Coordinates of C-alpha atoms in Angstrom, one line a residue:
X1 CA 6.8 8.9 16.8
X2 CA 6.7 8.2 12.7
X3 CA 7.9 10.7 10.1
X4 CA 7.6 10.9 6.5
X5 CA 10.2 11.4 4.4
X6 CA 10.2 12.4 1.0
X7 CA 10.3 10.0 -2.5
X8 CA 10.6 10.0 -6.0
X9 CA 8.3 7.8 -8.1
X10 CA 10.4 6.0 -10.8
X11 CA 7.4 3.2 -11.7
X12 CA 4.6 2.1 -10.5
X13 CA 4.5 -1.6 -10.8
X14 CA 1.5 -3.3 -9.2
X15 CA -1.8 -2.0 -6.6
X16 CA 1.0 -3.2 -3.7
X17 CA 3.9 -2.2 -5.1
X18 CA 5.9 1.0 -7.2
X19 CA 9.5 2.1 -7.5
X20 CA 10.5 5.0 -5.7
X21 CA 13.9 6.8 -5.6
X22 CA 14.9 7.1 -1.7
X23 CA 17.8 8.6 -0.6
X24 CA 19.1 9.1 -4.4
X25 CA 18.3 4.9 -4.9
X26 CA 15.8 3.5 -6.8
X27 CA 14.0 1.0 -4.9
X28 CA 10.7 -1.2 -4.8
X29 CA 8.4 -0.4 -2.1
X30 CA 6.0 -2.7 -1.1
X31 CA 2.7 -1.9 0.9
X32 CA 2.3 -2.4 4.1
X33 CA -0.6 -4.0 5.4
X34 CA -2.7 -4.5 2.5
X35 CA -3.4 -7.5 -0.1
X36 CA -4.6 -6.2 -3.3
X37 CA -5.7 -8.3 -5.9
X38 CA -2.3 -9.0 -8.4
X39 CA -1.9 -9.0 -12.1
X40 CA 2.2 -10.2 -11.8
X41 CA 0.9 -12.8 -9.1
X42 CA 3.8 -15.9 -8.9
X43 CA 0.9 -18.4 -9.4
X44 CA -2.1 -18.0 -11.7
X45 CA -1.0 -14.7 -12.6
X46 CA -4.1 -12.0 -12.7
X47 CA -6.6 -11.9 -10.5
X48 CA -10.2 -10.5 -10.2
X49 CA -10.0 -6.4 -9.3
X50 CA -5.9 -6.8 -10.2
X51 CA -6.4 -4.4 -13.1
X52 CA -8.2 -2.1 -10.9
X53 CA -6.2 -2.0 -7.8
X54 CA -3.1 -1.4 -10.3
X55 CA -4.7 1.5 -12.3
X56 CA -5.8 3.1 -8.9
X57 CA -1.9 2.9 -7.4
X58 CA -0.5 3.8 -10.9
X59 CA -3.0 7.2 -11.1
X60 CA -2.7 8.0 -7.4
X61 CA 1.0 8.4 -7.4
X62 CA 1.7 9.5 -11.1
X63 CA -0.7 12.2 -10.6
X64 CA 0.6 13.7 -7.5
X65 CA 3.0 16.3 -6.5
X66 CA 4.7 15.0 -3.4
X67 CA 5.1 11.9 -2.9
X68 CA 6.0 10.7 1.0
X69 CA 6.8 7.3 2.5
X70 CA 6.6 6.3 5.6
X71 CA 8.4 3.6 7.5
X72 CA 6.6 1.7 11.0
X73 CA 8.7 0.9 13.8
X74 CA 9.3 -2.4 12.5
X75 CA 11.4 -3.7 10.0
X76 CA 11.8 -1.0 6.9
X77 CA 12.9 -4.3 4.3
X78 CA 11.0 -7.5 3.4
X79 CA 13.3 -10.1 2.6
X80 CA 12.8 -9.6 -0.9
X81 CA 14.7 -6.0 -0.6
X82 CA 11.4 -4.4 -0.7
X83 CA 11.2 -1.6 1.7
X84 CA 8.2 -1.7 4.0
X85 CA 6.1 1.6 4.3
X86 CA 3.1 3.4 4.1
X87 CA 3.1 6.1 1.3
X88 CA 1.7 9.7 0.6
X89 CA 0.6 10.8 -2.5
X90 CA -0.4 14.9 -1.6
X91 CA -1.1 14.0 2.1
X92 CA -3.3 10.9 1.1
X93 CA -1.7 7.5 2.1
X94 CA -2.3 5.2 -1.0
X95 CA -2.6 2.3 1.5
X96 CA -5.8 3.3 3.1
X97 CA -7.4 5.0 -0.3
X98 CA -7.1 1.1 -1.6
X99 CA -8.8 -0.7 1.3
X100 CA -11.3 2.0 1.8
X101 CA -12.4 1.7 -2.2
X102 CA -12.2 -2.1 -1.7
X103 CA -9.2 -2.6 -4.0
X104 CA -7.5 -4.6 -1.3
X105 CA -7.9 -6.4 2.1
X106 CA -6.3 -5.5 5.1
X107 CA -3.4 -7.6 5.0
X108 CA -2.8 -10.5 8.4
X109 CA 0.3 -8.8 10.6
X110 CA 1.7 -10.1 13.9
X111 CA 5.3 -7.7 13.5
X112 CA 5.6 -4.7 14.7
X113 CA 5.1 -2.6 11.5
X114 CA 1.4 -2.4 13.1
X115 CA 1.2 1.6 14.0
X116 CA -2.2 2.2 10.9
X117 CA -3.7 -1.5 11.3
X118 CA -6.7 -0.2 13.0
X119 CA -7.4 3.1 10.6
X120 CA -7.3 0.7 8.0
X121 CA -9.4 -1.6 9.6
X122 CA -12.0 0.8 9.9
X123 CA -11.9 1.6 6.8
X124 CA -12.1 -1.9 5.3
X125 CA -15.2 -2.4 7.5
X126 CA -16.5 1.0 6.0
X127 CA -16.0 -0.7 2.3
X128 CA -17.6 -3.6 2.8
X129 CA -20.4 -2.1 4.9
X130 CA -20.8 -0.6 1.2
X131 CA -20.2 -3.0 -0.6
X132 CA -17.0 -1.9 -3.1
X133 CA -15.9 -3.9 -5.5
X134 CA -14.1 -6.7 -3.5
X135 CA -17.0 -6.4 -1.3
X136 CA -19.5 -7.4 -3.3

């Protein structure tokens, strides 16, 4: 089973990336299973809804009383050294919240980190049915 662990917000970086203090070590976390429009995209830079996605993630984590990270069953860090996890703010998953608001798309996945793929898929479907942001 997966389990939530405490972490401390250091700095929100992008809609899909936040820096946290985890087990006394500062580290960058990439939100599992979601693709948000980027402000800091390597090529081209800022996309439509990039600033909106970043502000949403930032607002959600900064106003949170408790931040928790939930690693999945596969690899816990990507090739860039970023922790791969589901991030919770006062019990609500940031990953799902972004998708539900149509501020992120469920990323393509096939590796073992897919425990919440179905849950996210359902919220994404709802967001496109309601024609929210990205889905307009």
